[PDB]
Design a protein around this ligand. Structure first.
Ligand SMILES: C[n+]1cn([C@@H]2O[C@H](COP(=O)(O)OP(=O)(O)O)[C@@H](O)[C@H]2O)c2nc(N)[nH]c(=O)c21
Ligand SMILES: *[C@@H]1O[C@H](CO)[C@@H](O)[C@H](O)[C@H]1NC(C)=O
Length: 246
């Protein structure tokens, strides 16, 4: 399991949590020096538990699929919640079995479905460590509209930060003040599968992507990523979705 406490949290303790989260995901291989997540894992071992504590010390446990960093569901006191999707239903076979009741949220874990439930795109939802404290608190008691927004915050501040060092840094900058995500942040989230695929296809193509990946940069400018020498590959991306899962 990995853990993160909002009480006393600072850029450093958050950085230690995102490092723990990355290090909890198993890999047998690196591709271009980036850990390659596994094609699959059997049974309970497929799921990492993240224990998150709001500023007051209340906690949820979030179940994450270690092959793709997808949040499947979470436990809040004696109630479990899972996304309305087959992979989460399968997860519910393995985690939080001791919950007194299981609620299936009325959406899947897809960014578009979450944004429609929440009533807003994530361009307009501030993220940061204060927003994560709020998200944890919201998820403590069921409210499906409020929870969609909380889950947009939670997914970006945990999974997306584990995946991209830039997103981790964006959150550290927002340790004491929320702010909506930069265009670059949104771009990276949206390209993770694409990037993962192109970095693995590069392995037999002299480091060159079969198909260029288009991103937005730090100044809000649209750039083409064509090969493994790009800073996005050498510095930013920390985990690769296995092409078997693409
Ligand atoms: C396809 N899918 C992607 N995710 C992840 O959940 C978040 C939003 O899902 P998405 O809109 O599919 O992501 P993307 O367009 O950025 O790839 C991102 O972290 C995705 O990696 C997903 N998460 C869940 N729980 N279930 C899914 O089917 C699923
Ligand atoms: C590879 O990527 C770098 C940009 O990161 C660029 O300077 C170079 O022109 C690209 N070359 C090829 C052959 O794709």
């Amino acid at each position: 399991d990995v853990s993160f406490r909002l009480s006393g949290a600072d850029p450093s303790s958050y950085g230690m949590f995102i490092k723990d989260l990355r290090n909890a995901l198993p890999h047998t291989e690196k591709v271009y020096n980036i850990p390659l997540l596994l094609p699959s894992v059997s049974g309970a071992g497929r799921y990492l538990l993240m224990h998150l504590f709001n500023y007051d010390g209340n906690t949820i446990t979030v179940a994450v699929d270690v092959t793709n960093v997808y949040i499947m569901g979470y436990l809040a006191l004696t109630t479990s919640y899972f996304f309305n999707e087959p992979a989460a239903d399968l997860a519910s076979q393995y985690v939080f079995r001791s919950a007194r009741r299981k609620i299936t949220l009325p959406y899947s874990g897809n960014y578009e479905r979450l944004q429609i439930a929440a009533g807003k795109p994530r361009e307009k939802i501030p993220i940061g460590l204060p927003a994560l404290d709020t998200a944890i608190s919201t998820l403590l008691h069921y409210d499906s509209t409020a929870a969609a927004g909380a889950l947009l915050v939670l997914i970006q501040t945990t999974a997306e930060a584990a995946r991209f060092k830039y997103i981790e840094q964006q959150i550290q900058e927002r340790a004491y003040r929320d702010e909506v995500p930069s265009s670059a942040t949104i771009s990276l989230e949206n390209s993770w599968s694409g990037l993962s695929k192109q970095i693995q296809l590069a392995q037999g193509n002299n480091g060159v992507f079969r198909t260029p990946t288009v991103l937005v940069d730090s100044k809000g400018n649209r750039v083409q990523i064509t090969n493994v020498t790009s800073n996005v590959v050498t510095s930013n991306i920390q985990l690769l979705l296995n092409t078997k899962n693409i």
